[PDB]
Every structure is written in C-alpha cells, then in structure tokens.
C-alpha cells in the first residue's frame, strides 16, 4: 500500500500516467473505441486481448507486466438514470477489487461514464462520488485524469474538501 494513501488529479492524457496500473474507460466488447479508450488502445494494444466484459464490471489484462483494468461504465444513452447509477457504482467497486488484488501502490483512473457515455449530462460529481465510495477503503495512491480545466478545478476542490 502507499505510506499515506492520497487522491490527486491531473489534466493530461492517462496514456502518459506515472502510476503502477491504469483503468481504461472501456466498452463491453473490447473495441478500440474513442477518447480515453482509444488513447489506451494506442499505448497498450496488447491489453485488449480478451478484454470484453459486461457493463458494471472490470477485467484486467496485462500489457507486459503493466496492468490495464478495463472498467465498463454504463452508456447513459441506453440506461435509465436509476439503472445507470447502479451499474456505474458497480464498475467502480470492481475496479477497487482489481486494484486490491494486483497489490499496486498507485492507479491512474478516469471518470467513468462522462464523455460519450454521459447521455449528454454533466456527471462529474456522480462519477467522482462513486469513485470515492469504491476507492476510499483501498490504500493505493489514486491519480484521477481529466482533460477539461474546469473539471480539473472541480475534482481538485472535491478532493481538498474531504482533507
């Protein structure tokens, strides 16, 4: 575990992360996809061998010795708000199980079901709070990656609020 487990946020490509493993905002079919998923495919394509997994689950595939945790958040275009909320919470619980199983001291993680799976809604707070609910009992250093300056500010505020 980390000596003093922390949350941090960085605004940059998660393919350039400085952590011991990465969480992919994956699709259920293990396809290259768009956004984070496409960046992850370009950097770690070997990790997409048998990475298909259902919504609300996470499946780890090693790229060399570097673990890629493929976490499938719901696409809110297809799910009701209630069912999507449940599957988004579940995906993050599976990420915490995998991070624990792997024995890593740090993990790079995007906010699941934002961007093209958001169903056109701002889900920063919903997605971040489900991330915290799952990861707070883990002792890995968590580094959240985002692309928007205003999201960086809001994630940073949410982290600092609870310290």
Ligand X SMILES: O=C(c1ccccc1F)N1CCNCC1
Give me the residues that bind ligand X (CB under 6 A), please.
114-115, 118, 120-122, 147-148, 151
Residue 12 touches Cl ion, criterion: CB under 5 A: yes
Closer by beta carbon to ligand X, 97 or else 147: 147
Tokens of 102: 């792997």
Closer by beta carbon to ligand X, 18 or else 150: 150
What b/e readout covers 71-94, taking b as 16+ CB neighbours within 10 angstroms?
bbbbbbeebeeeebbebbbbbbeb
Among 46, 81, 148, 157, binds Cl ion (CB under 5 A): 148
Residue 151 touches Cl ion, criterion: CB under 5 A: yes
Residue 117 touches Cl ion, criterion: CB under 5 A: no
List phi, psi (to 5°) of 144.
-90, 130
Please identify which residue in the block is written with the tokens 């259902």.
54
User: Annotated binding residue at 35?
Assistant: yes
| Residue 57: contacted member of Cl ion, ligand X, none (CB under 5 to 8 Å, by partner type) | none
Half-sphere exposure of 8 (CA within 13 A, CB side): 15
| Residue 122: contacted member of Cl ion, ligand X, none (CB under 5 to 8 Å, by partner type) | ligand X
Closer by beta carbon to Cl ion, 139 or else 152: 152
Which residues neighbour 86 within 8 Å (Cβ) at sequence distance 6 or greater?
Answer: 56
Question: DSSP 3-state assignment of 49?
Answer: coil
- Of 10-18, 50-58, 93-101, 129-137, the window that binds Cl ion (rule: CB under 5 A) is 10-18
Specify which residues 59 forms β-bridges with.
Answer: 70
Tokens of 34: 């768009």
User: Annotated binding residue at 27?
Assistant: yes
Closer by beta carbon to ligand X, 67 or else 74: 74
Binding residues: 13, 27, 35, 115-117
């Amino acid at each position: 575990g980390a000596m003093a487990p922390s949350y941090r946020v960085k605004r940059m490509d998660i393919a350039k992360n400085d952590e011991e493993c990465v969480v992919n905002a994956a699709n259920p079919r293990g396809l290259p996809g768009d956004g984070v998923c496409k960046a992850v495919y370009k950097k770690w394509p070997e990790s997409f061998k048998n990475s298909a997994t259902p919504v609300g689950t996470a499946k780890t595939v090693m790229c060399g010795t570097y673990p890629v945790i493929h976490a499938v958040g719901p696409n809110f275009s297809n799910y009701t708000e209630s069912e999507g909320d449940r599957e988004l919470a579940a995906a993050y619980r599976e990420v915490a199980k995998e991070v624990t199983r792997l024995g890593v001291n740090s993990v790079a993680i995007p906010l699941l079901s934002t961007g093209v799976y958001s169903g056109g809604k701002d889900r920063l707070t919903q997605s971040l709070n489900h991330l915290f609910t799952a990861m707070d009992s883990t002792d890995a250093d968590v580094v959240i990656y985002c692309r928007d300056k205003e999201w960086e500010k809001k994630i940073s505020e949410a982290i600092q609020m609870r310290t």
